[PDB]
């Protein structure tokens, strides 16, 4: 979408310049917008440079970030056909 | 009330040749047209404000003899007739003058190309435009609706006046005429031949079929069908008998089959004596289980 | 060919005064006209009316090709009052029991007129939706105002994975538009299956009424149709004869097939300054200018509906008249 | 109980001591209600647990109701200590404590209606103090309660006809 590329161009300009950015997103339309831009900014730089650190507020947003990362890896293994160095860790509760 | 009469003339070069050979010359094309002009003046005098429209069907295409077609081309003069000199309604004399100017253009256009184009039937286009012009005339006259009574005048001559190519469009025209509540006063003129499609159209559109062989009385048969078409059918009429047909025939074979068979979800006419190898009607697959049970019984 | 199963909502939700005078007085009234719209274009098809009253499903009209059986069935519903709740599971399971006598060669259709917003089903309704796909039953639900999530899955899974059949009505004029499209068939892409049907006898028009003859009723009659197989003078109808299971149609099936083969060629509306022809009609005499909005920038422009099959000029009035009934453009029959 | 016997039938009310299994059973049965053509009433707390976030379907509540505006527990020593603490810091006394906190507890209700551009949803807000604050996509029209009953009947039929028109 073109509206998702507006926040993605701001995420590609603040991750390589600013140190902290208060970016507002609409509800139900900004989950995978910053998800793909975080793996693209690392692919534009170095893939073993700065890794992604996600800080949710609930355990559901931890679980919802894992299935979107599977869609990011499925879009990188079907549109490219190459299996790179995988990542992603589900740091949940102890019980 | 007003009564609209739609006369569909079938002018052709083979109809004037069959009437001048079979039984010698039993009447030319202008001898029956004068008696039809006497029947047209009787219909205009039977009721006030009675409209009339004439549409011919030649070999090279259909054309409108009257219905203000010659006046529409003149706006965008006579031919010296004896009917115009006998006075009695100038609207009937102008319709005879426009028909005389249209018959003179038909003889000027009749040549080797018109005789070579007499291989199909122009009655299918005359029935499709005839019901559409009657729907256009009824829509133009909202106040006081008239009684639309179509009177088909098919001249059964030689060549290929009746075939499978014109029976499909006449069947759609008969379903359109029955939906428009218009009676089809059929009249089989020419040789002694009765068509099953003309008998089924008079039974579906609640019309009258008259079989006139050779010629006989021109005005004797014109004063009998003019008393039931313009009327509101108060009687039980007097149409021709033996018109009860099955209204179906095998197009792939060429004969009437009592027990037919459907196609492959296409509802095409097919004989039950056919094996149905991938349905001989269109490009589709047939059922092997239905072919196994039909071959056993 | 077709075996439509009408599913009507007859509950307390139809007691609301949304329509004039209410929902139930217009649903029953417009369905009688839909019976007239169905048996005219499809004289050899079937109909079945199933109401949903008091949380159940009641059969008021048996599956038959006679149109008068569905008229008198709807005249008894307007006398009583629609009560209870709709039951979609009992109506579909009753529609499944009647479409099992319907063969695979005849198309099985289910039309649901759902004006409520909540139903009462016994068991799981998702076990009934998947059963309609296993035996290929095309289900179409007509929902009122708000949408139901059940009818979205019913008009998609039973309709080859395409949700476009669950229509939402908003007016009584739009409700008659749904009865015009449902009267017409659904020539889809299907699943490419084989099709072959036979045993179609012809009815002999008999008019013997002296001591009469009736093989399907044994009563007095003013003339019945004689079967070409068992030679029985039963009732005059274009359906099947009730003595040897053979058809008895005539030109009624030919008129339906002619409408089915009618592709309806619309005439191309070219202007009078563009087609270089005068204002004339191939069907009648349209000698008036079409466009006349501006001064001379539109009045001289006009429009002439030139049918591309014979290059004949026409108007906008006869272009819809030739595509409705008879043959599409009368200039096609002349070469 | 006419809505609890002829409309929503079953009742899904979130208690003050909401158990994790009770919140799990009320969530699954709410998905079982809308997947059977029934519909249920999810009586939750805007200040309570489970802020949700999962929707993008017709199984969720298409119409979300809010009882007034979200408030905070006042007359407490924890609030009076943080009031004078932020009064010396940012001087936002008796302003952001009743508005910025009341917005974020209402914005958790706004994050569930906006479930993408493909799904619709209607979120009504009561009282008159909501006009002093802002909201996500500020396109809000003020009407009465009985007036919006005829507006939502139109919005539940226009959105069913404009879905295939904008595609
Ligand atoms: Zn076929
Ligand atoms: Zn029989
Ligand atoms: Zn016209
Ligand atoms: Zn044409």
Three-class DSSP labels, chain A = CHHHHHHHHHHHHHCCCCCCCCCCCCCCCCCCHHHHHHHHHHHHCCCCCCCCCCCCCCHHHHHHHHHHHHHHHHHHHHCCCCCCCCCCCCCCCCC
Residue B166 CA to residue C318 CA, distance in Å, equals: 21
Chain C hits for B136, Cβ within 8 Å: 281, 283-286, 317-318, 321
Answer whether C230's CB lies under 8 Å from C241's CB: yes
Residue B248 CA to residue B267 CA, distance in Å, equals: 12
State how far residue C47 is from chain D, nearest Cα, in angstroms.
27
Answer whether B248's CB lies under 8 Å from B260's CB: yes
Determine phi and psi for D87, rounding to 5 degrees: -70, -35
Contact C197/B291, CB-based, under 8 Å? no
Residue tagged 């979408």 (tokens): A1
Answer whether C123's CB lies under 8 Å from C94's CB: no
Residue tagged 């469009």 (tokens): B169
The length of chain A, given as a count of residues: 95
Chain D hits for C164, Cβ within 8 Å: 164
Answer whether B260's CB lies under 8 Å from B272's CB: yes
Chain D contact present for A28, CB below 8 A: yes
- CA end-to-end span of chain C, whole Å? 36
Where are the strands (E) in chain C, listed by range?
A: 2-9, 46-52, 58-64, 107-114, 138-144, 167-169, 197-200, 204-205, 225-226, 240-241, 246-247, 268-270, 304-306
Residue B183 CA to residue C52 CA, distance in Å, equals: 45
Is C320 in a helix, a strand, or coil?
A: helix
Q: D61, D109, D117, D120: best mutation site toward chain A, by most A Cβ within 10 Å?
A: D117
* Three-state secondary structure string covering C112-181: EEECCCCCCCCCCCHHHHHHHHHCCCEEEEEEECCCCHHHHHHHHHCCCCCCCCCEEECCHHHHHHHHHH
Residue A18 CA to residue C60 CA, distance in Å, equals: 74
Write b or e for each residue in B221-241: b if 16 or more Cβ atoms lie within 10 A of its Cβ, otherwise e.
Answer: bbeebbebbbeeeeeeeebee
Give the ranges where B90-150 is alpha helix by DSSP (H).
Answer: 90-109, 112-116, 123-140
Which residues of D sit within 8 Å Cβ distance of A? 51-56, 110-117, 136-137
Residue B59 CA to residue B109 CA, distance in Å, equals: 10
For D7, the closest chain C residue by CA position comes to: C118
β-pair partners for B66: none
Answer whether C328's CB lies under 8 Å from C265's CB: yes
Residue B73 CA to residue C4 CA, distance in Å, equals: 53
Ligand 3 centre to CA of C31 (Å) is 34
Contact C195/B284, CB-based, under 8 Å? yes
Residue C94 CA to residue C221 CA, distance in Å, equals: 35
Choose among C228, C251, C260: nearest Cβ to B258: C228
Q: In terms of Cα–Cα distance, which of A68, A70, A80, A18 is closest to A43?
A: A80
Answer whether B10's CB lies under 8 Å from B123's CB: yes
Q: In terms of Cα–Cα distance, which of C98, C109, C119 is closest to C52?
A: C119
Answer whether B115's CB lies under 8 Å from B160's CB: no
Residue D32 CA to residue C126 CA, distance in Å, equals: 12
CA C152 to chain CA mean position, Å: 22
C-alpha pair distances (Å), C18 with each of C24, C99, C172, D153: 10, 33, 10, 11
Ligand 4 centre to CA of C314 (Å) is 10
What element of type H or E holds B172? helix B167-179
Answer whether B170's CB lies under 8 Å from B123's CB: yes
Residue B265 CA to residue B242 CA, distance in Å, equals: 33
Q: In terms of Cα–Cα distance, which of D94, D106, D97, D98 is closest to D70?
A: D106
Q: Which residues, 6+ apart, have CB-to-CB distance to A9 below 8 Å?
A: none
Residue tagged 């539940």 (tokens): D156
Residue B115 tokens read as: 């005789």
C-alpha pair distances (Å), D102 with each of A56, C177, C243: 22, 50, 80
C-alpha pair distances (Å), B23 with each of A80, B72, B194: 90, 41, 19
Residue C286 tokens read as: 């349209």
Residue B36 CA to residue B95 CA, distance in Å, equals: 12
Chain C hits for B163, Cβ within 8 Å: none
Is D84 in a helix, a strand, or coil?
A: helix
Residue B178 CA to residue C115 CA, distance in Å, equals: 37
Other beta carbons within 10 angstroms of residue A55's beta carbon come to 6
What region, left, alpha or beta, does residue B215 occupy, with left being phi > 0 and alpha being psi -120 to 50 degrees?
alpha
- CA end-to-end span of chain B, whole Å? 60
Residue tagged 């070409």 (tokens): C228
Give the CA dihedral D119, D125, D131, D136, nearest 10 degrees. Answer: -20
Q: Is A38 exposed, middle or buried (0-12, 13-18, 19+ CB in 10 A)?
A: buried
For A64, the closest chain D residue by CA position comes to: D54
The DSSP call for residue C305 is E
Ligand 1 centre to CA of B270 (Å) is 10
Residue C258 CA to residue C277 CA, distance in Å, equals: 32
Where are the strands (E) in chain D, listed by range?
A: 11-13, 41-43, 63-64, 122-123
Answer whether D31's CB lies under 8 Å from C149's CB: no
Answer whether B265's CB lies under 8 Å from C174's CB: no
Residue C319 tokens read as: 């272009």
Choose among B126, B136, B279: nearest Cβ to C318: B136
C-alpha pair distances (Å), C86 with each of C118, C119, C174: 8, 5, 23
Q: A23, A25, A27: best mutation site toward chain D, by most D Cβ within 10 Å?
A: A27
Q: In terms of Cα–Cα distance, which of C1, C43, C49 is closest to C239?
A: C43
State how far residue C40 is from chain D, nearest Cα, in angstroms.
31
Breaks (C-N over 2.5 A) in chain D follow: none
What region, left, alpha or beta, does residue B119 occupy, with left being phi > 0 and alpha being psi -120 to 50 degrees?
alpha
Peptide bond before C172: cis, by omega within 30 degrees of 0? no
Residue A80 tokens read as: 């490219």
Residue D88 CA to residue C186 CA, distance in Å, equals: 75
Residue tagged 């006579």 (tokens): B78
Q: Does chain D touch chain C (at least 3 C-beta pairs within 8 Å)?
A: yes
Choose among A26, A29, A61: nearest Cβ to D53: A61
Answer whether B140's CB lies under 8 Å from B85's CB: no
State how far residue D114 is from chain A, nearest Cα, in angstroms.
5
C-alpha pair distances (Å), C117 with each of B131, C145, D7: 47, 9, 9
Residue C168 CA to residue C142 CA, distance in Å, equals: 6
Torsion sign over Cα C72, C76, C82, C86: negative
Residue B178 tokens read as: 């029955």
Residue B72 CA to residue B70 CA, distance in Å, equals: 6
């Amino acid at each position: 979408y073109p509206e998702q590329y507006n926040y993605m161009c701001d995420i590609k300009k603040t991750l390589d310049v600013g140190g902290n950015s208060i970016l507002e997103m609409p509800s139900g339309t900004g989950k995978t917008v910053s998800l793909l831009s975080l793996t693209i900014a690392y692919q534009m730089h170095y893939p073993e440079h700065r890794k992604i650190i996600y800080c949710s507020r609930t355990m559901s947003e931890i679980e919802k970030a894992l299935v979107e990362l599977e869609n990011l890896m499925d879009y990188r293994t079907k549109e490219l056909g190459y299996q790179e160095d995988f990542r992603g860790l589900g740091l949940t509760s102890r019980k | 009330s007003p009564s609209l009469l739609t006369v569909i003339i079938e002018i052709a070069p083979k109809l004037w040749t069959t009437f001048d050979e079979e039984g010698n010359e039993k009447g030319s094309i202008i001898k029956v047209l004068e008696a039809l002009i006497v029947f047209l003046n009787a219909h205009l005098a039977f009721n006030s404000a009675n409209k009339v429209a004439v549409i011919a069907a030649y070999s090279q295409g259909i054309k409108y003899l009257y219905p203000x077609x010659x006046x529409x081309x003149x706006x965008x003069x006579x031919x010296x007739x004896x009917x115009x000199x006998x006075x009695x309604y100038r609207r009937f004399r102008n319709v005879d003058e426009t028909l005389v100017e249209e018959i003179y253009k038909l003889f000027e256009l009749e040549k080797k190309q018109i005789e070579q184009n007499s291989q199909r039937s122009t009655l299918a286009g005359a029935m499709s435009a005839g019901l559409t012009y009657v729907n256009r005339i009824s829509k133009e006259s909202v106040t006081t609706s008239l009684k639309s009574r179509l009177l088909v005048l098919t001249c059964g001559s030689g060549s290929s006046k009746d075939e499978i190519f014109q029976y499909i469009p006449i069947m759609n025209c008969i379903f359109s005429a029955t939906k428009m509540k218009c009676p089809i006063d059929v009249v089989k003129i020419g040789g002694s031949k009765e068509s099953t499609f003309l008998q089924q159209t008079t039974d579906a559109t609640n019309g009258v079929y008259l079989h006139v062989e050779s010629t006989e009385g021109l005005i004797q048969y014109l004063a009998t069908a003019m008393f039931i078409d313009p009327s509101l059918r108060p009687i039980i009429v007097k149409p021709n008998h033996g018109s009860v047909d099955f209204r179906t025939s095998c197009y792939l074979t060429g004969r009437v089959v009592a027990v037919g068979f459907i196609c492959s979800v296409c509802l095409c006419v097919l004989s039950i004596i056919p094996p149905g190898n991938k349905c001989p009607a269109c490009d589709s697959q047939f059922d092997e289980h239905v072919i196994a049970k039909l071959k056993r019984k | 060919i077709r075996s439509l199963i009408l599913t009507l909502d007859c509950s307390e939700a139809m007691l609301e005064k949304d329509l004039r005078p209410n929902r139930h007085a217009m649903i029953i009234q417009y369905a009688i006209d839909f019976v007239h719209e169905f048996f005219d274009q499809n004289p050899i098809s079937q109909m079945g009316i199933i109401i949903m009253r008091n949380g159940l499903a009641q059969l008021v009209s048996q599956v038959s090709g006679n149109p008068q059986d569905h008229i008198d069935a709807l005249k008894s519903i307007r006398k009583q009052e629609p009560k209870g709740n709709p039951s979609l599971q009992n109506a579909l399971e009753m529609a499944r029991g009647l479409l099992l006598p319907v063969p695979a060669h005849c198309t099985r259709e289910v039309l649901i007129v759902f004006g409520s917003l909540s139903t009462t089903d016994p068991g799981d309704i998702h076990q009934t939706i998947d059963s309609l796909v296993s035996e290929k039953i095309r289900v179409k639900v007509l929902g009122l105002s708000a949408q139901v999530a059940i009818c979205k899955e019913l008009c998609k899974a039973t309709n080859y994975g395409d949700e476009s059949f669950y229509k939402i009505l908003l007016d009584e004029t739009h409700l008659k538009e749904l009865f015009n499209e449902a009267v017409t068939p659904x020539x889809x892409x299907x699943x490419x299956x084989x099709x072959x049907x036979x045993x179609x006898x012809x009815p002999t028009r008999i008019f013997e009424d002296t001591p009469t003859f009736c093989s399907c009723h044994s009563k007095l009659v003013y003339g019945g149709y004689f079967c070409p197989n068992c030679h029985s003078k039963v009732c005059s109808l274009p359906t099947v004869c009730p003595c040897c299971d053979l058809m008895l149609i005539l030109x009624x099936x030919x008129x339906x097939x002619x409408x089915x083969x009618x592709x309806x060629k619309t005439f191309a509306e070219v202007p009078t300054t563009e087609k270089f022809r005068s204002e004339d009609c191939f069907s009648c005499q349209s000698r008036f200018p079409x466009x006349x909005x501006x001064x001379x920038x539109x009045x001289x422009x006009x429009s002439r509906y030139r049918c591309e099959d014979c290059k004949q000029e026409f108007c906008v009035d006869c272009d819809v008249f030739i595509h409705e009934i008879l043959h599409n453009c009368p200039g096609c029959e002349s070469k | 109980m006419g809505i609890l016997d002829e409309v929503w039938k079953h009742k899904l009310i979130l208690v003050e001591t909401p158990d994790a299994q009770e919140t799990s059973l009320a969530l699954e049965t709410y998905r079982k209600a809308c997947s059977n053509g029934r519909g249920a009433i999810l009586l939750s707390v805007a200040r309570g647990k489970v802020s949700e976030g999962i929707d993008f379907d017709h199984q969720y509540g298409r119409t979300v109701l809010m009882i007034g505006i979200p408030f905070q527990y006042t007359e407490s020593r924890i609030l009076k200590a943080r009031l004078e603490f932020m009064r010396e810091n940012y001087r936002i006394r008796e302003n952001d404590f009743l508005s910025f906190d009341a917005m974020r507890h209402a914005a958790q209700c706004l994050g569930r209606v906006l479930r993408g551009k493909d799904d619709y949803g209607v979120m009504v807000l009561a009282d008159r103090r909501f006009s002093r604050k802002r909201s996500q996509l500020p396109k809000w029209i003020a009407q009465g309660l009985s007036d919006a009953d005829l507006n939502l009947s139109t919005d539940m039929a226009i959105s069913n006809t404009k879905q295939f028109l904008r595609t």
